[PDB]
Structures are given as C-alpha cells and as structure tokens.
Write a protein that binds this ligand. Structure first.
Ligand SMILES: CCCC[Se]C[C@@H](O)C[Se]c1ccc(S(N)(=O)=O)cc1
Ligand SMILES: CCCC[Se]C[C@H](O)C[Se]c1ccc(S(N)(=O)=O)cc1
Ligand SMILES: [Zn+2]
Length: 257
C-alpha cells in the first residue's frame, strides 16, 4: 500500500495512481517573483465561529481532526472561490528535522510543517462527489516554522499520546480552528490536486503567505506518532510530505502586492 517509505513513497505512487504525472498536481514551488497580483481576487472569508470538531484519527499517513459537515457551520468563501465550501477536517504534514516537512515551498524554502484545512463545495452535496469535480475542494494551507509556541495548537499536541498508532481515534470536541490561523489572510492561489493518493485534480489551493510559529516541543510531539498499527514494529510518523511537482500550464496568483 502507498506511503512515505523508500519502497512505497511518492516516486512509486504513479504505478497505482497514474494521475500522479498529470497536468495539475500538487504541491508546487511558489516562485514569489513569478506569482502575479490579481487585484480582482477578494479577501478570504473564514467563518469558523460555529465549527463543531468531533474526533481525532491517526489514519496511518497523518492525523485528521474531523468536523461536523452535515450543516453550514464552518465555511470558507470569497477569495478565488465561487460559492460555499464546508470544513470537513484538518491535518498536517511534517518533517524529521525542522528544515523540511512542508509540501508547498516558497522560493524553494521548505518549512517545518504545513497545515491543511480541507473544505468541500456544497453544490456537490457530499465530499465523495466533490472530489470528482475540478472545483470540488478548497484547501487552506498554512506553513509552520519553529520558534514560539502556538497556544491554540496545544490541545491537539496533548491528545496525540492517545492516538499513537494507525487506526486509533479519540473524542475531540470543542476545538476552535481559529486558534491555528496567522494574523494576515494574504494568500497565493492555484488549481491543483490532493497531495496523497488518489491525487485527484479537484482542489483550489489557497496558501497563506504568513506562517504560524510553533515550538520545538510541539513539533517533537508530532514526531512521536507512528505510521504502524499497535503491536507492530515502531515506524515514526515523520516526513509525510510529497515534494513539489511540475507547475506545467498554471499561473499562481497573489492576493497582495
Ligand atoms: C476560543 C479561542 O481559542 C479561539 Se482563537 C481566536 C482568535 C481570534 C479571534 S477574533 N474574533 O478574530 O479576534 C477569534 C478566535
Ligand atoms: C473514499 C472517499 C472519497 C475519495 Se478521496 C480518498 C481519501 O479520502 C483521501 Se482525502 C484527502 C484530503 C486532503 C488531502 S490534501 N493533503 O489536503 O491534499 C489529501 C487527501
Ligand atoms: Zn494535506
């Protein structure tokens, strides 16, 4: 099965998922000098005041914080988007060392980690339908750098001991994802894909320019997670990131000058 090892990692994925070599794959390097300011892009609208978190799951590739998406409770609108996109889950990608871990890069700079807040277009009715559509998903990407602690991340860090291994889940109610945002909502945007199999070309990527700061102790706790199931030999959950893919016939747009 696919993963991030020597034998099943990103360079192998094309054999089961040929769209891996497609025309709008993610992530990409954001060349900040080549991205064009698009004065017609709107401010992002992030409306998370009524978000209902439910559960946290170790899926063997990352951990997902899942939300109630059965109503318009936590939505993303505006920016490059037409219509309303409902928050379904967030997860991270991170490194074994602070100098790697992000999926997107900025002028080839790798951050320690990257947060993905995943949303689906409500005109398609459910997430499974939305991933079959070129405008089905909107993923809000936020870089993490190591420095000062992020206080709004700590409730996530403290539960990870309870979901160490693949298939473990824990109740995770009343978590406020607004605590993970930076101050500025300035962003880059481009059409892309899921960054894991099945690599479907269904994502409007919205990547915030301002990173959030997390502490070394916070990311060290991410790196204590396991890819393996309980009672299997330990394989630390680190370097769960896909490298940058060819931009091909795409333009990255900036919301800011
Ligand atoms: C609960 C608390 O942990 C969530 Se972080 C938070 C930070 C700022 C804002 S606001 N209204 O945009 O100034 C809202 C929420
Ligand atoms: C069977 C249900 C529908 C088929 Se999609 C299969 C599975 O649910 C992957 Se969900 C996924 C979401 C976000 C990302 S990312 N890193 O943000 O681009 C990656 C994957
Ligand atoms: Zn992701």
């Amino acid at each position: 099965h696919w993963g991030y090892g020597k034998h099943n990692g990103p360079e192998h994925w094309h054999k089961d998922f040929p769209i891996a070599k497609g025309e709008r794959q993610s992530p990409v390097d954001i060349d900040t000098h080549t991205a064009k300011y698009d004065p017609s892009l709107k401010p992002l609208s992030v409306s998370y005041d009524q978000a209902t978190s439910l559960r946290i799951l170790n899926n063997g590739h990352a951990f997902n914080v899942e939300f109630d998406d059965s109503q318009d409770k936590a939505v993303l609108k505006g920016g490059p988007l037409d219509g309303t996109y409902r928050l379904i889950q967030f997860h991270f990608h991170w490194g074994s060392l602070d100098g790697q871990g992000s999926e997107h890069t900025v002028d080839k700079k790798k951050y320690a980690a990257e947060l993905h807040l995943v949303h689906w277009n409500t005109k398609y009715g459910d997430f499974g339908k939305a991933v079959q559509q070129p405008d089905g998903l909107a993923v809000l990407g936020i870089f993490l750098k190591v420095g000062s602690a992020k206080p709004g991340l700590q409730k996530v860090v403290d539960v990870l001991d309870s979901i160490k291994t693949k298939g473990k889940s824990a109740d995770f109610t009343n978590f406020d994802p607004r605590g993970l945002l930076p101050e500025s909502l300035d962003y880059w945007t481009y059409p892309g894909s899921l960054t894991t199999p099945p690599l479907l070309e269904c994502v409007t990527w919205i990547v915030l320019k301002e990173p959030i700061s997390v502490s070394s102790e916070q990311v060290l706790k991410f790196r204590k997670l396991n890819f393996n199931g309980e009672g299997e030999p330990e394989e630390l959950m680190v370097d769960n990131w896909r490298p940058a893919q060819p931009l091909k016939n795409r333009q990255i747009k900036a919301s800011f000058k």
